[PDB]
Design an enzyme around this catalytic site. Structure first.
Site, PDB file in Angstrom:
ATOM      1  CG  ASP A   1      -7.830   2.327  -0.041  1.00 14.44           C
ATOM      2  OD1 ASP A   1      -7.088   3.253   0.351  1.00 14.44           O
ATOM      3  OD2 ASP A   1      -9.073   2.347   0.084  1.00 14.44           O
TER       4      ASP A   1
ATOM      5  CD1 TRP B   1      -3.354   0.761   0.650  1.00 14.37           C
ATOM      6  CD2 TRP B   1      -2.023   2.380   1.445  1.00 14.37           C
ATOM      7  NE1 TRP B   1      -4.089   1.921   0.703  1.00 14.37           N
ATOM      8  CE2 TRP B   1      -3.295   2.930   1.182  1.00 14.37           C
ATOM      9  CE3 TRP B   1      -1.015   3.213   1.950  1.00 14.37           C
ATOM     10  CZ2 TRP B   1      -3.585   4.278   1.403  1.00 14.37           C
ATOM     11  CZ3 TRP B   1      -1.304   4.553   2.170  1.00 14.37           C
ATOM     12  CH2 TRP B   1      -2.578   5.071   1.895  1.00 14.37           C
TER      13      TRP B   1
ATOM     14  CE1 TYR C   1      -2.738   8.542  -1.500  1.00 15.34           C
ATOM     15  CE2 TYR C   1      -0.869   8.985  -0.052  1.00 15.34           C
ATOM     16  CZ  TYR C   1      -2.068   9.388  -0.633  1.00 15.34           C
ATOM     17  OH  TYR C   1      -2.585  10.642  -0.342  1.00 15.34           O
TER      18      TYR C   1
END
Length: 288
Positions: free
Chosen positions: A245, A225, A229
């Site tokens: 997510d 993650w 991101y």
DNA sequence: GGCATTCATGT
DNA sequence: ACAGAAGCC
């Protein structure tokens, strides 16, 4: 709100462009003494190489222009500042191309852009700190860090620079922990601050982003993650998607972090924009 | 407090 | 893909 510079510059953008949203987004994540966000106004300290100063950006919705004002110390490196503003605000985006490819998911908020950063490292530090905590708390935490390890401007004493990979690698992990964070995370920061210091962390968008993120996820504290991101905000990789997510699994009525990887395929090569439209489009639901 | 998301690891 | 450290009521 008083001109911090004598030199002014203008950047064109292609409508549509939701500036209230953008500025809303950045304002929430605004780090106190580093940046100042308001109604149609954004300002921040900036380091380009050895040059320092303040930049402000004022949208002009009437004429598809962004107005940039630079402090004197930033003039010699104006073009690069503008390139940073452009990556921060996604000025080169072709909304028609993106939205047309997002089909139905594009329709509700066509002026959504991809909020970027001014510095891939800075973004990396942000990505780690905002890890598990709330958007708000990351903001307060990151302000504490910067307050300690950030460098002040000689011409604008109410502004301080986001901490460099140097002051940050030389950080005492415990002094960091005291600013209110796990040891494992202060150590993450220092690691990153070291990679970047020794070329190991790409500052400009890599040619193979998936490959580059592989390498990232092998960093302490950085997983899939945090890596995704960061590619999105730090490199402005526009074809990145996050099936893991929390907010996305919620918007996918019983669907596995693999079933959606095939659903979001329908939105290549603009999966980053697709991801954003999902987050910020409440009314939205998958074409079951 | 026992339980739970929630993202990070490692077999 | 398949099973540990950091609010929820």
């Amino acid at each position: 709100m008083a001109d911090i510079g004598s030199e002014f510059y203008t950047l064109n953008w292609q409508p549509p462009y939701d500036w209230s949203w953008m500025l809303g987004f950045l304002a929430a994540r605004a780090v106190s003494s580093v940046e100042t966000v308001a109604d149609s106004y954004y300002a921040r300290s900036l380091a380009v190489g050895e040059y320092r100063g303040v930049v402000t950006a004022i949208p002009d919705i009437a004429r598809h222009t962004l107005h940039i004002n630079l402090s004197a110390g930033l003039e010699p490196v104006a073009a690069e500042c503008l390139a940073k503003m452009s990556r921060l605000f996604d000025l080169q985006c072709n909304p028609q191309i993106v939205n047309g490819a997002l089909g139905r998911l594009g329709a509700a908020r066509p002026g959504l852009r991809l909020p970027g950063c001014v510095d891939a490292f800075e973004q990396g530090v942000r990505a780690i700190l905002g890890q598990l905590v709330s958007v708000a708390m990351a903001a307060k935490l990151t302000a504490r860090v910067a307050q300690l390890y950030g460098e002040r401007l000689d011409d604008f004493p109410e502004y301080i620079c986001f901490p460099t990979p140097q002051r940050l690698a030389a950080a005492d992990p415990q002094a960091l922990k005291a600013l209110g964070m796990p040891l494992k995370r202060a150590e993450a920061l220092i690691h990153l601050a070291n990679a970047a210091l020794e070329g190991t962390l790409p500052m400009t968008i890599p040619g193979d982003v998936e490959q580059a993120m592989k390498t990232l996820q092998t960093f302490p504290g950085i997983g899939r993650w945090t890596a995704n991101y960061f590619a999105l905000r730090g490199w402005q990789a526009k074809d990145v998607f996050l099936p893991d997510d929390c907010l996305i699994k919620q918007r996918f009525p019983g669907m596995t972090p693999a079933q959606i990887r095939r659903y979001a395929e329908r939105w290549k090569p603009w999966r980053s924009y697709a991801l954003l439209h999902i987050w910020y489009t409440e009314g939205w639901q998958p074409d079951e």
